[PDB]
Amino acid sequence: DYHEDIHTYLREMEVKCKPKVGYMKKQPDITNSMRAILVDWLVEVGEEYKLQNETLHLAVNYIDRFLSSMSVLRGKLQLVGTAAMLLASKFEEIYPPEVAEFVYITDDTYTKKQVLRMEHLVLKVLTFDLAAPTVNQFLTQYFLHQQPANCKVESLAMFLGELSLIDADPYLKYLPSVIAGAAFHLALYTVTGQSWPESLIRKTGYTLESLKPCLMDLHQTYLKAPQHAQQSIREKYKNSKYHGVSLLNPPETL
Amino acid sequence: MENFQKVEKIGEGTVVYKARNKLTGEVVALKKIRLDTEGVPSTAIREISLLKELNHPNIVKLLDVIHNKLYLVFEFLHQDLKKFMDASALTGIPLPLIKSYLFQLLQGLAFCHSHRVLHRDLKPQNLLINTEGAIKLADFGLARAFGVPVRTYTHEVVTLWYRAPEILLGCKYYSTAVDIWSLGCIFAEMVTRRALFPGDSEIDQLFRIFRTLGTPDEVVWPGVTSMPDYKPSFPKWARQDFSKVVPPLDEDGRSLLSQMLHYDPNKRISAKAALAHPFFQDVTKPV
Numbered sequence A: 001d002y003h004e005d006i007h008t009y010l011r012e013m014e015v016k017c018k019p020k021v022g023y024m025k026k027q028p029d030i031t032n033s034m035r036a037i038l039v040d041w042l043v044e045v046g047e048e049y050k051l052q053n054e055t056l057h058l059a060v061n062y063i064d065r066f067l068s069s070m071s072v073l074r075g076k077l078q079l080v081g082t083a084a085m086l087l088a089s090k091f092e093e094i095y096p097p098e099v100a101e102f103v104y105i106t107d108d109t110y111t112k113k114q115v116l117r118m119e120h121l122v123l124k125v126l127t128f129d130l131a132a133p134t135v136n137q138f139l140t141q142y143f144l145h146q147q148p149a150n151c152k153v154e155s156l157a158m159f160l161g162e163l164s165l166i167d168a169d170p171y172l173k174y175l176p177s178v179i180a181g182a183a184f185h186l187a188l189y190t191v192t193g194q195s196w197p198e199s200l201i202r203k204t205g206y207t208l209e210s211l212k213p214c215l216m217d218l219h220q221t222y223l224k225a226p227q228h229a230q231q232s233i234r235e236k237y238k239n240s241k242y243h244g245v246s247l248l249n250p251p252e253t254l
Numbered sequence B: 001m002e003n004f005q006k007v008e009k010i011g012e013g014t015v016v017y018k019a020r021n022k023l024t025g026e027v028v029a030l031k032k033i034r035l036d037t038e039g040v041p042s043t044a045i046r047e048i049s050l051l052k053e054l055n056h057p058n059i060v061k062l063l064d065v066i067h068n069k070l071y072l073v074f075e076f077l078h079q080d081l082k083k084f085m086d087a088s089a090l091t092g093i094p095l096p097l098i099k100s101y102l103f104q105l106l107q108g109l110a111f112c113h114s115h116r117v118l119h120r121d122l123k124p125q126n127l128l129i130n131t132e133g134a135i136k137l138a139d140f141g142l143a144r145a146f147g148v149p150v151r152t153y154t155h156e157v158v159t160l161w162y163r164a165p166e167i168l169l170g171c172k173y174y175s176t177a178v179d180i181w182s183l184g185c186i187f188a189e190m191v192t193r194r195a196l197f198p199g200d201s202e203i204d205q206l207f208r209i210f211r212t213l214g215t216p217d218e219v220v221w222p223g224v225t226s227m228p229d230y231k232p233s234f235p236k237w238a239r240q241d242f243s244k245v246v247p248p249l250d251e252d253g254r255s256l257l258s259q260m261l262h263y264d265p266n267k268r269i270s271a272k273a274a275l276a277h278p279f280f281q282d283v284t285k286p287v
């Protein structure tokens, strides 16, 4: 095992790759509501083009990093997130969808030129740093610490992990490693009744006490999930693929 | 852009020029990448993003990027390990230089792996040498950031001669072992100045391995006989003596090489463990 090496490196790079917490206030023509619609759309693109959960998580991090230091108008937010998904695809995916396909899913809102010219710009602003740590990267590590592998816990924690991609407020205020911490405990507690494993307290240094604030927000998010304007993630995790875990009854208290 | 004066063309794939910075005098390698229809190629996206996270004495340094062609600017080294082997063919490479070179490749590779990066193309033509006697991992275009545990990644990885058996037998999962295999195949190719497994086909490559390391069974490599391209019809060849396979190589040399060429990837020696092997008890830095 050289896992410990990688975990240390990922925890270090998640602070350097983290976007600026409050960048939405600074955005003149754009809002959290408009971001959440863009992110939900990329889940539909993600599920339609049978792409990895990593690819989605990676494009959003590219999206938030870019908006952290570039002003964009509402008519342009769909180009940024398109060019973001194309790069996250080119990076993460064995068979990345081609440009002209990424065009087709905008319904010709933008040209091939526009998508290609935005990719060049997104690389420049991100200074070709694409290997960012995601919620997903940490979750898949966390999953090896279940004594009993539980495919329901895994699909739910993933489910809970995607919900946060939708809501800048208040997930941007949390590190990926912490969000994944909340999503695993809450997923485990929901199906088995168990909690944050001792082995992960050692690996991560996070007590339930440290995860409380993220767990509170993530718990409300899970409770209010079927009334959220955004619903593509619940539709996605209704499939037998993910053991229809979005249908599960959330817990009440903790 | 205009600062660089091209000295020579020094190779082609994915063209590479030797150049000089006209204002600082610095010698560099320019990797020219042509675009034109599909945007910026996936190889450049991956090579650039990964090399920027990989700062090691034994990993080639990326100095800059330039954008309609794309230029990667790397530090220059005058030699690749293939041109060096084809120059030592007759005389042979000295033992303590093979030990230095191996030790250095394992060091870069340990750093790579511990930064969740697979090379997936370790062959001599992609390993670069300077005059002070340093060797460095190069060509990260076929590389990839990997997860824990890994998920299924591209099947067509590593040059056939250095391809690991779990790829040839088409295991759903492969990881860090496949790079350790490659170096085993290299270590042997320095010791005996000949490609260890020079197969022309996926079938020949397998058979060349079996004929040398013996045909794996469920006792060497549990799960093998139920791998997607494992046929029960394969000749069961016996394992050769390493006296015959690497005749020059000492007892510690042999111990390290077998461990690096294990069939079962979960048992193969890691880059981290290999560095601590008794073969490496008296290392120096020759030229």
Ligand SMILES: O=[S@@]1CCc2c(c(-c3cn[nH]c3C(F)(F)F)nc3ccc4[nH]ncc4c23)C1
Pocket (backbone or CB within 6 Å): B010, B011, B012, B013, B014, B015, B016, B029, B031, B060, B074, B075, B076, B077, B078, B080, B125, B126, B128, B138, B139
């Ligand atoms: O034939 S090219 C010359 C050496 C070389 C190669 C390559 C290379 C390796 N595999 N493929 C290539 C290329 F794509 F042909 F360029 N990369 C580099 C990078 C830096 C460097 N500095 N000095 C030499 C090189 C170098 C192989």
